[PDB]
Ligand binder design. Structure first.
Ligand SMILES: C=C1CCCC2=NC[C@H](C)[C@@H](C)C[C@@]23CCC(C(=O)O)=C[C@@H]3[C@@H]2O[C@]3(C[C@H]4CCC[C@@]5(CC[C@@]6(O[C@@H](CC[C@@]6(C)O)C1)O5)O4)C[C@@H](C)[C@@H](O)[C@H]2O3
Ligand SMILES: C=C1CCCC2=NC[C@H](C)[C@@H](C)C[C@@]23CCC(C(=O)O)=C[C@@H]3[C@@H]2O[C@]3(C[C@H]4CCC[C@@]5(CC[C@@]6(O[C@@H](CC[C@@]6(C)O)C1)O5)O4)C[C@@H](C)[C@@H](O)[C@H]2O3
Ligand SMILES: C=C1CCCC2=NC[C@H](C)[C@@H](C)C[C@@]23CCC(C(=O)O)=C[C@@H]3[C@@H]2O[C@]3(C[C@H]4CCC[C@@]5(CC[C@@]6(O[C@@H](CC[C@@]6(C)O)C1)O5)O4)C[C@@H](C)[C@@H](O)[C@H]2O3
Ligand SMILES: C=C1CCCC2=NC[C@H](C)[C@@H](C)C[C@@]23CCC(C(=O)O)=C[C@@H]3[C@@H]2O[C@]3(C[C@H]4CCC[C@@]5(CC[C@@]6(O[C@@H](CC[C@@]6(C)O)C1)O5)O4)C[C@@H](C)[C@@H](O)[C@H]2O3
Ligand SMILES: C=C1CCCC2=NC[C@H](C)[C@@H](C)C[C@@]23CCC(C(=O)O)=C[C@@H]3[C@@H]2O[C@]3(C[C@H]4CCC[C@@]5(CC[C@@]6(O[C@@H](CC[C@@]6(C)O)C1)O5)O4)C[C@@H](C)[C@@H](O)[C@H]2O3
Ligand SMILES: [Ca+2]
Ligand SMILES: [Ca+2]
Ligand SMILES: [Cl-]
Lengths: 216, 210, 211, 211, 217
């Protein structure tokens, strides 16, 4: 019965932490110019599924890793039975509105929408996705291959509210499907800055550039 | 000071969304101006077996409400915020000759500024009625589709444009189809049945195989 | 004025939707007339490998409730308003021979007038059962699909039309298919089991491949 | 008096839905009979590259609950009403060998009668596992799909039919496929693990390409 | 105290009281933790290989995915509730494990009612029927040796110190396999694998579904 109570007790601690973080205190309304947020973005490309030259659409399957850190999600694990992290439904917390800028169909989510929250206040959210986007696969049947590119970024926040960044410019290809119809020649993920004439604030995206060819 | 910034935004939003009778939509005594514009990104597909064409575009919608106005001084110099499109009233702007339900490609979030203006820009994929005959020639094909309120007249939603030129500066350079022109013309009509004006925006695209 | 216009509208909605009972649907003692009409916009596709045809149309539905009545004088001269179709009772009018769920193309919003009348006009894409044999001939193909209430007899929902001619004034001029005729005929059926009449509107379209 | 018929119905629905315990599902001590019947409307598609066939049918389901009975004399002679299927318990009848989620074609509304019986007739399009080999010959193709509760044994839901003949009186006369026969046969099975009987209805359809 | 007062009540009455006590009253289960890990047993019953697309290297499978776990917070004494030993609940009204195909190419399509069976020992049985498109090269399907493909299933967000994924057998149940499928199964195995990463001390668990198949002659 001791072990049963320890288990009951760890649950009570997890619920106390969640109740402290989500119900007792005000939650996150989203970033502002006086409280900007850094979102780190990374791609793990799994498969090029289809390259359609009649419409110039290509379909990719990838994991999109999103990470940010909030003071409001920080806690001392000592105040909560040494809990260092927990899980939560992505709908229960603020998440950044990162979107592909040149999709041709709504993105299809392939993983459960659950985020990992760590005691330093960092949130990790890794939606697995199938995306159709604009791409001319001319060259795919040659040694040089085809090249396509799609930009990801916030829909409604500038770089003074959400600063987007990558930890590396190299797309993780260590999970790329070895028997895909297409082989990857290179895949890069590059933070780009753009300014509009109207406006002094920078606008940021991460450009996913994939060079690929028919596997032979 | 980051604490106070967040506190000010939370206060602004509860003041506007919880402590105030929120906008129930327009009336004939209280008409709303809605300004509409298109940024055409791609002609994805032109199907000659069914005469349907598929477009991807950003549809910019703007309107302004007194109920969404505030003084940035009372709220730590906050001049704008974001809200879910589901949490505010949005206009019922619809394509009149779509052949499939529109597919939304962007997060359904609007930008509200302190002057009460709301900007909502859904990226959409639309299939609509279009005969692509001529697309494989130099002159190209021409198609058209009207957008407007489904249930409000021009005395209720005053639908306007800022320009008759569709923005082509985001158009995909390697589309199967090149754009010869794209216009967005406001049409104000009076039908014999009724005294109210009815307004639509007629999107006309002339295009050909690249 | 504009703060009073909005105040009265919100007050009218409150009085209809929160301070009297909402409509539980028709009964044999309190039957409801529903008037139905079609505006055919396009025959998108005719599939001879499965005998399905796809139409796009606007389906106009009209009914009238004493519980949606008001005196405009008591509400600042407001003579109509709009409501989500989810927030009111609507009639269960269904195609009887569809092959895929109907796809709705228009915002699901209804128009309520002070006389209690409701107007609801969904734009729809429908796939239904149809053999398009003859479509590539001068005589063309002919198909038909019935619409009616799924669960109410004619003693509970009295289905009517205003005309037996489908409105073809919005028909897409450059469709793959040219319309030869489109009619919408009220039909009354009687089953031997049952004294009550069963009503449908039979949409019959004759069409052929354009020239 | 039409305000009184409306009020009587609201009073009936309040008494049944809000002022007594709603039905939580069957139990071993109190099992429920569910009667199932098919009305086959169309074979839309037979796909010999994946061995899937698509059917449109009406699936009639009927059960009876003490908790839904009333005396019509206590409620202005109301003998039946309609309810959204979402607002009452419904049985978990499932095709066991579908290959795509079922697609519902009719409004999800049930008919409740004063004896407590509930009638629910969803129209559905179903893709299921079927080898159409022979469909282009005179003897035709034969396929079968079982239906039953996903989670209740025969000691909890006693599944029955009224007839082993599938109703073909609404079958589309201009389908690509004609029906040679269609039967719905109650089957009882036991598993080594367990004493309870498990019940299904085997829908067996023989069909061929129409001439 | 005796446990006789419940015997006088309708079985439905007792069922509603049981659900009420477990769901409405008990603060429910926040999911597993390192201090309170959960065992989840996973098993597959393969019903059909519907489609093998050599133009995209996607294969479509239909199968029943059996999931079983046991929670203390869902235990009860049948003697307090008219000898009710089990009940059904919407899968949306309880916690369920986040078991995910790792190499799907389309969202899974659910083919059965999302209802779970809860037994008085606290065990939950949940068996969604599913259609899955996943990454698979079917080259060789038109030969005697056939094609081989694999797809791993596991928790998306929990390590092996939080959800221990188990199997009852490494044999995929083929006793419901569609006898007239376009494809015949040569073999089908489900192997629990433990993965260790350079970065991290926690083990990670998946079940690898490996199917060898060919076109039925
Ligand atoms: C909802 C929106 C923008 C949605 C469309 C886009 N969103 C991501 C960011 C903010 C844009 C810079 C890019 C854009 C998506 C991708 C894109 C392209 O690839 O060409 C163009 C998008 C851009 O977005 C607007 C107005 C945007 C440009 C930057 C300055 C500004 C002015 C205020 C501001 O308004 C926007 C949000 C941020 C804010 C408040 O600073 C309003 O941005 O307008 C409008 C589009 C129709 C398109 O023409 C292009 O211009
Ligand atoms: C829900 C509706 C109309 C939905 C269909 C359309 N909506 C947008 C506006 C209001 C119409 C002028 C156009 C219409 C869509 C496009 C269209 C076409 O391209 O041909 C025809 C649409 C029109 O809409 C009605 C009645 C509409 C015409 C204008 C006057 C009026 C009378 C009252 C009013 O009712 C309508 C709303 C506005 C209101 C209250 O002022 C009822 O409009 O009826 C009904 C359709 C079936 C179609 O025949 C055509 O006629
Ligand atoms: C939910 C339902 C019926 C759903 C299916 C249909 N609904 C619309 C009306 C009520 C039917 C006459 C037609 C029917 C749809 C179209 C159709 C066909 O094209 O063949 C057949 C539908 C019919 O509907 C039933 C029982 C219906 C026939 C008329 C008398 C009656 C008996 C009571 C009653 O029950 C029905 C509702 C009305 C009610 C209460 O008066 C039960 O209707 O049963 C059941 C079907 C399986 C089919 O065989 C055919 O018979
Ligand atoms: C959710 C479920 C079963 C879902 C799958 C099926 N459901 C309908 C009924 C109950 C089964 C007899 C058939 C089955 C669907 C069709 C099918 C087939 O055609 O092969 C096999 C289904 C069966 O269902 C299990 C365990 C089922 C068989 C009978 C006894 C029992 C033991 C307890 C019990 O658990 C089940 C519910 C009923 C209950 C509580 O009495 C657990 O059923 O387990 C599990 C499947 C993987 C499959 O192998 C086959 O065996
Ligand atoms: C949401 C996630 C991971 C989602 C992706 C995957 N989830 C299931 C488990 C946890 C992974 C080991 C596998 C992985 C799916 C399958 C897969 C593959 O087949 O290659 C790779 C997935 C993996 O998951 C990450 C970070 C994962 C590796 C193990 C250690 C760690 C660090 C903390 C932790 O973070 C993850 C949850 C568990 C936790 C908190 O312990 C964060 O796991 O990161 C992230 C992916 C982009 C991919 O590169 C690969 O690496
Ligand atoms: Ca007209
Ligand atoms: Ca007892
Ligand atoms: Cl008109």
């Amino acid at each position: 019965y001791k072990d049963d109570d320890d288990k009951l007790h760890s649950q009570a601690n997890l619920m106390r932490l969640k109740s402290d973080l989500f119900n007792r205190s005000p939650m996150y309304p989203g970033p502002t110019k006086d409280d900007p947020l850094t979102v780190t973005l990374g791609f793990t490309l799994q498969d090029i599924v289809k390259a359609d030259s009649s419409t110039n659409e290509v379909d990719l399957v990838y994991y999109e890793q999103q990470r940010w850190k909030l003071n409001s999600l920080m806690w001392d694990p000592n105040e909560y039975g040494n809990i260092t992290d927990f899980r939560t439904s992505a709908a229960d917390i603020w998440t950044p509105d990162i979107t592909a800028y040149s999709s041709t169909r709504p993105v299809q989510v392939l993983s459960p929408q659950i985020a990992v929250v760590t005691h330093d206040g960092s949130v990790m959210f890794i939606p697995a996705q199938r995306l159709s986007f604009m791409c001319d696969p001319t060259g795919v049947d040659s040694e040089e291959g085809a090249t396509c590119a799609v930009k990801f970024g916030s829909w409604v926040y500038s770089g003074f509210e959400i600063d987007l960044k990558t930890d590396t410019d190299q797309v993780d290809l260590s999970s790329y499907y070895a028997s895909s119809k297409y082989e990857i020649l290179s895949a890069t993920q590059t933070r780009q800055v753009q300014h509009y004439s109207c406006c002094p604030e920078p606008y940021i995206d991460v450009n996913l550039v994939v060079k690929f060819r028919e596997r032979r």
